[PDB]
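testing teh design pipeline on a random one, pls ignore if ur not involved
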């Protein structure tokens, strides 16, 4: 837990209003579950440790970090009000990967595979009830 990594994104805050929606339940039970178990999930399952990876410029470049471990905790802790907040977290995670890394890098190929699955799952996001 190096001082050279930033504090991870918030996953708990009693002041933030929270809700469970059928769409959020789908995001946890279907979307996150699908991506979390994938062969290529591991680079995305926790915040980037820039010290362990020797990437001193990572948090110079990436000012909006997000990862699936944070998303998992947000969903498990019912942090969100709506599905769009969670979808935006997934989109931020993918975009950070694409911004920092070169096209065709292994991590990008991995992100692209997960993003394809994500798109399919979000196209099937249920009507809010
Ligand atoms: O599912 C996995 C396990 C291992 I070790 C490496 C990559 N994906």
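output:
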């Amino acid at each position: 837990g190096s001082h050279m990594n930033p504090p991870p994104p918030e996953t708990s805050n009693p002041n933030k209003p929270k809700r469970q929606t059928n769409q959020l339940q789908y995001l946890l039970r279907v979307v996150l579950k699908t991506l979390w178990k994938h062969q290529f999930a591991w680079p995305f399952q926790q915040p980037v440790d820039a010290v362990k990876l020797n990437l001193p410029d990572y948090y110079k470049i990436i000012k909006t970090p997000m990862d699936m471990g944070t998303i998992k905790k947000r969903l498990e802790n019912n942090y969100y009000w709506n599905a769009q907040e969670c979808i935006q977290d997934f989109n931020t995670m993918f975009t950070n990967c694409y911004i920092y890394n070169k096209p065709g890098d292994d991590i990008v190929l991995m992100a692209e595979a997960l993003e394809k699955l994500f798109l399919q799952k979000i196209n099937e996001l249920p009507t809010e009830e």
